Amino acid sequence: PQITLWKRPLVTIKIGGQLKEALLDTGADDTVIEEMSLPGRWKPKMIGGIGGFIKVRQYDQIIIEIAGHKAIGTVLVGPTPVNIIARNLLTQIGATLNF
Amino acid sequence: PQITLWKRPLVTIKIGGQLKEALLDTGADDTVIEEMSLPGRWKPKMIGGIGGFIKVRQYDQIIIEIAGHKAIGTVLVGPTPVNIIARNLLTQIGATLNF
Numbered sequence A, B: 001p002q003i004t005l006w007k008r009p010l011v012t013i014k015i016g017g018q019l020k021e022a023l024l025d026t027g028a029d030d031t032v033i034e035e036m037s038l039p040g041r042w043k044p045k046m047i048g049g050i051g052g053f054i055k056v057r058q059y060d061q062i063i064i065e066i067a068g069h070k071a072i073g074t075v076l077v078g079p080t081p082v083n084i085i086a087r088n089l090l091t092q093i094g095a096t097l098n099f
């Protein structure tokens, strides 16, 4: 699809069996999702942006379906105010910025 | 251009005669740049990012060049980790997300 940016580029994602809304975010390095349980091992990480840092759990090799497209990669889980699909998974679905 | 996301989508901007690096950020509503002097009056604004809220200075109708495309619009000035070009100016230069 071609998504204009008049509004927030929100899409539906499926992760851990759950449906969620998420923002497509070229300004983010790693995908960050609101608190949920995921399978497998994790390790702690701090990630930072405007307003400072939050502590997250880093899970590797997690599958997410993004707007109908399957991608696999690292997912961070913690108290983010919005679900963010970042460049680590946007590359996998072939997403580009065009102007 | 067509910009892939394997690396940070950094571009050169020109504001007040000065070149700076900025990140093209579809996950941002308004454009935020590190402290610098801009002409005219400013209005208060709070913006909420990943780690909480911060106060910035809002300047309206600022001329900015972005990767060679001219935009004129609202620029926020405050303690951001990196200069971010958000959807309010990405729409002015005709940017879209594609996959």
Ligand SMILES: CC(C)CN(C[C@@H](O)[C@H](Cc1ccccc1)NC(=O)O[C@H]1CO[C@H]2OCC[C@H]21)S(=O)(=O)c1ccc(N)cc1
Pocket (backbone or CB within 6 Å): A025, A026, A027, A028, A029, A030, A031, A032, A047, A048, A049, A050, A081, A082, A084, A086, B025, B026, B027, B028, B029, B030, B031, B032, B047, B048, B049, B050, B051, B081, B082, B084, B086
């Ligand atoms: C500041 C950027 C360098 C990085 N951020 C991604 C960015 O797109 C966030 C994504 C975002 C979006 C909503 C809330 C929090 C974070 N947008 C943002 O902070 O925009 C602020 C300015 O315009 C406003 O509209 C959105 C909030 C304001 S970040 O959320 O802090 C972040 C940092 C590291 C990772 N791995 C994932 C995300």
Ligand SMILES: [Cl-]
Pocket (backbone or CB within 6 Å): A072, A073, A074, A088, A089
């Ligand atoms: Cl990854």
Ligand SMILES: [Cl-]
Pocket (backbone or CB within 6 Å): B044, B045, B055
């Ligand atoms: Cl103030």
Ligand code: NA
Pocket (backbone or CB within 6 Å): A039, A040, A041, A059, A060, A061, A062
């Ligand atoms: Na894992």
